[PDB]
Symmetry: D2
Subunit: 249 residues, 4 copies
C-alpha cells in the first residue's frame, strides 16, 4: 500500500532531507550511502522508530567501473526486496572537486565525477525502468551549469550529461508512465570544508535573501515533482537558486 | 487571509487558477475583459463557499495610453477589497497568427500589450503598492519551437520570459518572488477544429493523460506556496514532454 | 550588380563598423540614422569617395507608433530606390536606458525600448520579405539577456522579443530563401557617457583579454552570417562576448 | 610559419571536409583515424601532393579506458613532432548508436561517452598543457534538447561536450585559447540509410529541405578558428538550416 523510494547519497545534507520529507509524505525509503554508514543507519533507525519497517540502508560506490551496473541493479533490487515495489528514484549522490585543465589519476577523476553525476543515474534509471501508479525519477542537477566554477570541467560535464539524461529518459519512459524531472540548486548547504569568509562570499551573491537554500527547501521541490500535483510534468528542471543564476559577473 | 489577482480569470486556465487559489484559502480578484457574465458566475460560486472572498475587475489589457491606469486599477481593486495583495497571476493572453509575408499596429497592441506590457505594468503596480509575496507569469513551453506565422505572439512570450528574469532579480530585495509556468498543449482553442486538436494530442509523450487547466493551476499553486520560498526566476514547464519532441 | 544592404543606426559605433565592413566587402549600403545626420552624411560621403554611388542615408525614428510600419516600409524602399535590390537587413538600432519597477512617461519608454529593439525589426523584416542571390537578416541581440542588468526590464524584454523574432522569422522565411540570424555582443563599445572607472569594472569581467569587443569584432560576425560561408545557417545567434556570459556572480 | 591543426575522425565525411578546408587555409594537419586507415592515408597523400610535408596520419581508439589519457597525449604530441606547433584542435570523432533504457552497457558507456566527451576533455588538457591564434572547436549537435528516441548515452555525451566547451572556454581564456562549438542538425546522412528514410529527414529542414554538406559544417569551423572570430569563446554555432526550430 505505501509507495517506496530510493534516494542516493541519503545519509546527510540534501539527500537526508529528501529521504525524511518523502518518509513524512508516506513513502518507505531506501537510504543509499557510500562512506557514511553511521549516519545512514542512524537515519533509518529514526524513520523506523516513526513507522516500523519503513526504512532500509543500501551501501554502494557509484564510481564508474565494469561493476557499476551491478551496483545500480542492487540498489533498485534492495527496494523491491524490502518493500515489493519501487515508485520513486532520486538521483542525489554526487562527487564534486576541481579537475584543472593545466597543471588521483585523471582516469579515477573521470570515473568518480562522471560516474556519480551521470553514469550511475543512467544505470539506476535503466534498472528502475526494467523492474517496472505514479512512478517518477528526480535528478539533482545544478542551476549554475552554464556559468560554471573555474577548474571544475569534469563535474560540469557530468551535470550537463545529467540534463541530457533527464530529457532523454523523460522522452523514452513516458509511454511507461514514468516521469523524469530535475531539481537544480544554486547554493544550498555549502561544503563542510569551506571557511566562513568564503561561505559568506557565496551567500552575498544570492538576490533572494543573501543566503543559501536549506536542504529542506530543495527537498520541497523534489516532493512537488513526485506528487500528484506534477502528473503532467516530465523533462522539466526546476531551479531552486534564489535568483543566483540571473546575476551577471 | 492572503489575496490574489488573476488576469483573464473568467474561463479556462485562469478560472482554474482562481478556483484553486480560493480552495487554498486566498481571496481573489477575478479580472475580465469581455467575459463579464462568466466572471460574475465564478465570483458567485466562490462567495457561496466563503462570503466576500471574490470580487471582479473589468479591464482591457491591450496596450494604449490608458493601459498603465488600467493595470494600476486592477492592483488597487485587490487592496480595496481585501486590504493587501500577496499574489499576481499574469494569465490573460491574446493568441492568433501574424504572418510576415486588424492593422499590424492593433496586432502589436494586443499580442505584445497583453502578453508582455500589461504583465510589466501590473508588476510595477504590484511592487509599488508593497509575508509570501509572488508573481507567476503564464509563459509557453514552445517559445523556442514556435508555431509557424506566430511571430508577434512568440515575441510577446519571449518578452514575458525576460520580464520574469528581470523582475525576479530586481524585486528579490523586496522579498517578491517572480516565476513562470509554461504550458504546452492545455485546453485547446475552442475555435480549433477537432482533427487538428487530435494531431497535437498525438505528439505528447505523456499524452495517455489529458492535459487540463487543473494541471497548470497545480504548478501555479506550488510556486505561490511556502514550498517554493527559495524559487525565483524559474519557469516550470507543464507540457507532458511535448517540447522534447523533435520534428 | 553589387548587392545592397540596409543597416539601421549606422552613423556611429557598431552600426558604422557593420556598414563599413559590408561596403569593403562590395555591398552598396543604406545608412539609416535617427538623430546623427552629420555623422551619417559624413560616412556616406567617405564611402562614395571610395566607390561612387554606393552609399545613401535614410532618416527614421524607430519608436513604436501608428506610423512606424510606414517608416519601416520607407527604409526598405530607400534601398530599392537607390540600388534596385535589397539583399541584407541588419537590425542594429537600439535604445537603452533604465526603467526601474519601483520608484518620459512609461508609455513613451515602452514605445522607444520595445519599438527600436523589437517592433521595428519585425516591421523591417516584414517589409524586407514582402519587397522580394543570398538574402539574409542579422539582428543585433545581447549575450547577457539571461543575466540582465538590474532595472533594465523593458530593454531586456525587447532584446528577448528580438530572439523570438529571430527564431520565428527564420522558420517562416526559410521557404523564401531568406536566412535570419543574430549576433549577440557582451560588452563592446561602452556608452560614451560612462566614466573610465565604470568602463574598467566591465572590462575586468571579460575572461578573454579583460577588454571589450571592438566594433570591428562585432562586424566580423555579421559579415560571416551574410556570407556564402553561412548559407545553411538560419535561426542561430552567435555570441561575441569573450566569455562574459559564462562568468558566475 | 604555417600553423598546424589536429582533426579527430578526419578520414571521412565531416572530419575529412574540415581537414581539407583547414589545409586549403594554410594549415598543416594531423589526420586522426581509428578504423579508416586507407581513407586517412589517401587523404594525407592528396594533401601532401598539394604541398609537401603538410599532412600526417595518427591512429587511435578514443573509447574511454585506462590508456585513453596517454593516447590523447600522443595525438597532440604527434602534431608537435610533425610540425613543431599545434594551433588548432578539432574534436570531431564521434560514436553514435541507440542505447535503449528498456556490447555490454559498460562498453557502450566507454564508447559513447569516451568518444563524445572524455576524449575531447583529455585532448583539450593535452593541448593546453603543451602550449598567435590558438583555438579548439568541438562538434556538438543542434538537436541535443530534442533528442532521438533511445539515444540516451549519445545525448548525454553531447551534452557533456557543451559543458566542456563552456568550462574550457572559461578556464583557457587566460592563456588566449578560445573554445567553441559547431552544432550540425542533419548533415551527411548515415551510409546505410535508405533514400526514403533520408528524405524523411531532409523534408523536416526549413532551409532548402536538404541536409548540410560536410563543407557547410567545415565553413563554420574555419570561421571559428579564423582572425574574424578572435573575440568569440564559449559559443556554439548551430548549422542546421532551421531544423531545431521545428516543433513536433
Ligand atoms: N549543496 C549545494 O549547494 C548544491 C549546489 C548545486 C547542486 N547540488 C546537487 O544536489 C545534490 C545534493 O547536494 P549535497 O551538497 O547534499 O551533496 P554532498 O553532501 O556533496 O554529496 C551527497 C552524497 O554523495 C555521495 N557520494 C559522493 N561520492 C560518492 C560515490 N563515489 N559513490 C556513492 N555516493 C557518493 C556521498 O555519500 P556518503 O556520504 O555516504 O559517502 C555524499 O554524502 C548533489 O547532486 C549536488 O551536486 C548541491
Ligand atoms: N494550451 C494552452 O491553453 C496554453 C498553451 C500555452 C500557453 N498558454 C498560456 O496560458 C495562459 C492561459 O491560457 P488559456 O488558453 O486559458 O487563455 P485564453 O482562454 O486563450 O485567454 C485567457 C483570457 O485572456 C483574456 N484576454 C484576451 N485578450 C485580452 C485583452 N485585450 N484584455 C484583457 N484580457 C484579454 C481573455 O479574457 P476575457 O475572456 O474576459 O475577455 C481570455 O479569457 C495564457 O497566458 C496563454 O498564452 C496556454
Ligand atoms: N555596445 C555594446 O557593448 C553592446 C552590448 C550588447 C548589445 N549591443 C547591441 O548592439 C547594437 C549596437 O550597439 P551600439 O553600442 O553601437 O548601439 P548605440 O550606439 O547605443 O545605438 C545605435 C543607434 O541606435 C539608434 N537609435 C537609438 N534610438 C533610436 C530611435 N528612437 N530610432 C531610430 N534609431 C535609434 C541611434 O541612431 P542616431 O545616433 O542616428 O540617433 C544610435 O546611434 C545595439 O542593438 C545594441 O543593443 C551592444
Ligand atoms: N552527420 C550529421 O548529420 C551530424 C549531425 C549532428 C552532429 N554531428 C556531429 O559532427 C561530427 C561529424 O559527423 P560525421 O557524420 O562525419 O561523423 P561519423 O562519420 O559518424 O564519425 C566520424 C568518425 O568518428 C570516428 N570514431 C568513431 N568511433 C571512434 C573511436 N572509438 N575512436 C576514435 N574515433 C572514432 C570514426 O573514425 P574511423 O572512420 O577512422 O573509424 C568516424 O569516421 C560528429 O561529432 C557528429 O556527432 C553530425
Ligand atoms: C560540493 C557540493 C556541496 N557537493 C556536490 N556534490 N555538488 C556541489 N555543487 N556542491 C557545492 C559546491 C560548491 C558550492 Cl559554492 C556549493 C555547493
Ligand atoms: C548603451 C549601449 C552601449 N547601447 C545599446 N543600444 N545597448 C546596450 N546594451 N548598450 C550597452 C549598455 C551597457 C553596457 Cl555595459 C555596454 C553596452
Ligand atoms: C551517425 C552520425 C552520422 N554520426 C555521428 N557521429 N553523430 C550523428 N549525430 N550522426 C547522425 C545520426 C543520425 C542522423 Cl539522422 C544524422 C546524423
Amino acid at each position: 500500500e505505501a509507495p517506496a523510494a530510493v534516494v542516493t547519497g541519503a545519509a546527510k545534507r540534501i539527500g537526508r532531507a529528501i529521504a525524511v520529507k518523502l518518509h513524512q509524505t508516506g513513502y518507505r525509503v531506501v537510504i543509499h550511502y557510500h562512506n557514511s554508514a553511521e549516519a545512514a543507519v542512524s537515519l533509518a533507525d529514526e524513520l523506523n522508530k516513526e513507522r516500523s519497517n519503513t526504512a532500509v540502508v543500501c551501501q554502494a560506490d557509484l564510481t564508474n567501473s565494469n561493476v557499476l551496473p551491478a551496483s545500480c541493479e542492487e540498489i533498485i533490487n534492495s527496494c523491491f526486496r524490502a518493500f515489493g515495489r519501487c515508485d520513486v528514484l532520486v538521483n542525489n549522490a554526487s562527487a564534486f572537486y576541481p579537475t584543472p585543465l593545466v597543471q588521483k589519476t585523471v582516469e579515477t577523476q573521470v570515473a568518480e565525477l562522471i560516474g556519480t553525476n551521470a553514469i550511475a543515474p543512467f544505470l539506476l534509471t535503466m534498472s528502475f525502468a526494467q523492474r517496472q501508479s505514479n512512478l517518477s525519477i528526480v535528478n539533482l542537477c545544478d542551476a549554475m551549469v552554464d556559468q560554471p566554477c573555474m577548474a571544475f570541467s569534469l563535474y560540469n560535464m557530468g551535470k550537463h550529461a545529467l540534463v541530457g539524461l533527464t530529457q532523454s529518459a523523460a522522452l523514452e519512459l513516458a509511454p511507461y508512465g514514468i516521469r523524469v524531472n530535475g531539481v537544480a540548486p544554486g547554493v544550498s548547504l555549502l561544503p563542510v570544508a569551506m571557511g566562513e569568509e568564503e561561505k559568506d562570499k557565496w551567500r552575498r551573491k544570492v538576490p533572494l535573501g543573501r543566503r543559501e537554500a536549506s536542504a529542506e527547501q530543495i527537498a520541497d521541490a523534489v516532493i512537488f515533482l513526485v506528487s500528484g500535483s506534477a502528473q503532467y510534468i516530465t523533462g522539466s528542471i526546476i531551479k531552486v537558486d534564489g535568483g543566483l543564476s540571473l546575476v551577471h559577473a
